[PDB]
Amino acid sequence: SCESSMVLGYWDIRGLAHAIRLLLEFTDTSYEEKRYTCGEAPDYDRSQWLDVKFKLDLDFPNLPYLLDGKNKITQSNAILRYIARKHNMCGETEEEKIRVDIIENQVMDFRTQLIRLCYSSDHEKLKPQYLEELPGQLKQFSMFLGKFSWFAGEKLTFVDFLTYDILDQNRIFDPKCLDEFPNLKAFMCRFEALEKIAAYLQSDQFCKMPINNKMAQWGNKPVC
Amino acid sequence: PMTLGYWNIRGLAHSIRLLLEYTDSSYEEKKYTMGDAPDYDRSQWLNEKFKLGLDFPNLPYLIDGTHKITQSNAILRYIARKHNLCGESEKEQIREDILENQFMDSRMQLAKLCYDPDFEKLKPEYLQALPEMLKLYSQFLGKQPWFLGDKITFVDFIAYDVLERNQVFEPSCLDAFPNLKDFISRFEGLEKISAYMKSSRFLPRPVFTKMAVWGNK
């Protein structure tokens, strides 16, 4: 077998590693996972990471990180691109590549706003603003997707895993958001229907993972 | 020819303009002006924003024939591929990906600082942390001429922008790292770059939009 057992290191949180875990699962990539715990008390003790931080031989110590033998990667999009590239899950044609590159950076812009909103102490007063602006962003994703099966056109690429993650989080924040967009809703089902994804989504550990880290003003606790 | 639309600012368009010049791509720029008054009037963009036919309306944007691309990294990767200025081997590609993201990180770090009202008190916080940042980039570069090895790729244009920009923010920052200081020199020393830098189309400053606490205008 492949038996790579590449180690994925990140917090004991869904967060950024969610799209990576899903990609690994989907592509049957043999991996070992290393989860870092955080402090729950006012002093969010993250020493568990800091102790080994400078001992992993990473060029830019960060989380998540992936150690695949001689290849040690950091930065989420670099990890996704890496694994995906190995399974040809990137755009093949110039047109598909362009779409992939736009999506990758676009979901980054989207996710950032959400993270900011969820972690901020002003989360509540800011909440309405995010919501009143939400349909506009979802609108653009629906318009971009159109009649395609995947965001890259008719080919599943890493960007679908990214898009799913952020649309899911928003779905959790406001279940009704995707309703006026039957286009997106079809995408979500089609993605969760993939054998590897479906199995993982029903998995025990998956259910016990918080959306965001303990210091987040939202999603810091395990949900269903 | 190609059209590049962005504010009349250095900002996120810097790396793109440089890349375009280096590759001798025929292009025209559509610069947008922002209001100076309390109302930083962005109508010049907004009034045209949705009439361009972009899937995700945003600045900067590049229109190449039927291709309408947005997002800095997507525009750079497009022109790069168009001129073969990308990493080929998996190793180069890994460096390219980590660096692209890593450099965006640094960019946003400075940006937020310069736009945050508490700039005065936050500046020191940034300055003392800066060295460790540059250390990692210096080490990564090593004794190589360019970040991806011997061949200059699009990643170097992102590098130049963020490193050079930090140097204007604090001239002595790159002194302790001669490695990085020589990079800037070598880059500006490229025939097409130096020529462009003599051109009136340069626009090295302002760094940020008029509403930034530092490097505005």
Give the DSSP per-residue string, B132-148.
Answer: HHHHHHHHHHTT-SBTT
- CA A180 to chain centroid, in Å, comes to 24
B214 is in an annotated binding site: no
- Buried/exposed A190-221: b ≥16 CB within 10 Å, e otherwise: ebeebeebeebeeeeebeebbbbbbebbbbbe
Which residue reads 């895993």 in tokens?
A161
CATH number at residue B156: 1.20.1050.10
Q: What is the CATH number of the domain that holds B65?
A: 3.40.30.10
Which of A82, A101, A144 lies at the smallest CB-CB distance from B55?
Answer: A144
SS3 A35: strand
Q: Based on the domain organization, do B100 and B176 belong to the same domain?
A: yes
Q: Are residue B58 and residue B140 in the same domain, yes or no? A: no
> Of all helices (H) and strands (E), which one includes residue B74?
helix B72-82
Contact yes or no for B97 and A77 at CB 8 A: yes
Which of chain A's residues have a Cβ under 8 Å away from the Cβ of B154? none
CB contact under 8 A, A60 and B140: yes
Chain A residues whose CB is inside 8 A of the B56 CB are 102, 106, 140, 144
Which technique? X-ray
Residue A168 CB partners (closer than 8 Å, separation 6+): A188
Query: Amino acid identity, residue A182?
Result: P
Spell A155-171 as b/e; 16+ CB within 10 A means b.
Answer: bbbbbbbbbbbbbbbbb
**Residue B199: φ, ψ to 5°:** -70, 155
Is A162 within any annotated ligand binding site?
A: no
Question: Do residue B159 and residue B106 come from a single domain?
Answer: yes
A53 annotated ligand-binding residue: yes
**Rounded Cα–Cα distance for residues B120 and B25 (Å):** 41
Nearest CA in chain B to A138: B56
Q: Tell me: do B130 and B170 sit in the same domain.
A: yes
Number of structural domains (chain B) is 2
Residue for token digits 């140097």?
B167
- Pull the structure tokens for residue A140: 């653009």
Residues B183 and B209 in one domain: no
| Same domain (yes/no): B5, B78 | yes
Residue B185: CB atoms within 10 Å: 8
Per-residue DSSP letters for A47-100?
HHHHTTGGGS--SS--SSEEEETTEEEESHHHHHHHHHHHTT-S-SSHHHHHHH
Distance CA B81, CA B92 (A): 14
Of A75, A97, A102, the CB nearest to B101: A75
Quote the CA–CA distance of B166 and B171 in Å, as a whole number. 8
Same domain, B77 and B90: no
C-alpha span between A11 and A45 (Å, rounded): 12
Q: What is the distance between the alpha carbons of residues A158 and B64, in angstroms, rounded to a whole number?
A: 25
Q: Which of A78, A94, A104 sits opposite B94 (nearest CB)?
A: A78
Q: Are residues B47 and B110 in the same domain?
A: no
Q: What is the CB-side half-sphere exposure of residue B56 using CA atoms within 13 A?
A: 23
Q: Do B116 and B158 have their domain in common?
A: yes
Tell me whether residues B74 and A102 touch, CB distance under 8 A.
Answer: yes
Helices A158-173 and A94-119, axial angle in degrees (round to 10): 30
Inter-chain contact A71–B81, Cβ cutoff 8 Å? no
Q: How far apart are alpha carbons B45 and B41 in whole angstroms? A: 9
Distance between CA atoms of A159 and A164, rounded to whole angstroms?
8
Domains and CATH numbers, chain A: 5-89+195-221 (3.40.30.10), 90-194 (1.20.1050.10)
Q: What are phi and psi of B29, to 5 degrees?
A: -110, 145
Residue B162 domain boundaries: 86-190
First to last CA, chain A: 34
**Paired strand residues for A74:** A65
Q: Cβ atoms within 10 A of the Cβ of B111, count?
A: 17
Contacts of B100 in chain A (CB under 8 A): 77-78
Residues of B whose CB is below 8 A from A73: 94, 97-98
Do residues B216 and B119 touch, judged by C-beta distance below 8 A? no
Q: Using alpha carbons only, how large is chain A's radius of gyration in Å?
A: 18
Residue A171's alpha-carbon distances to A164, A178, A215, in angstroms, are 10, 7, 21
Distance, CA of B22 to CA of B192 (rounded, Å): 5
A66 forms beta bridges with: A8, A73
The secondary structure of residue B152, as a DSSP letter, is -
DSSP string, B31-72: EE----SSS---HHHHHHHTTS--SS--SSEEEETTEEEESH
Q: Give per-residue burial for A89-120: e unless 16+ CB within 10 Å, then b.
A: bbbeeeebbbbbbbbbbbbbebbebbbebbbe
- One domain for residues B104 and B155: yes
Please report the resolution in angstroms.
2.8
B78 — contact with chain A (CB < 8 Å)?
yes
Q: Which amino acid is at B143?
A: K
Please state, as a whole number, how many other Cβ atoms lie within 10 Å of the Cβ of residue B123.
Answer: 17
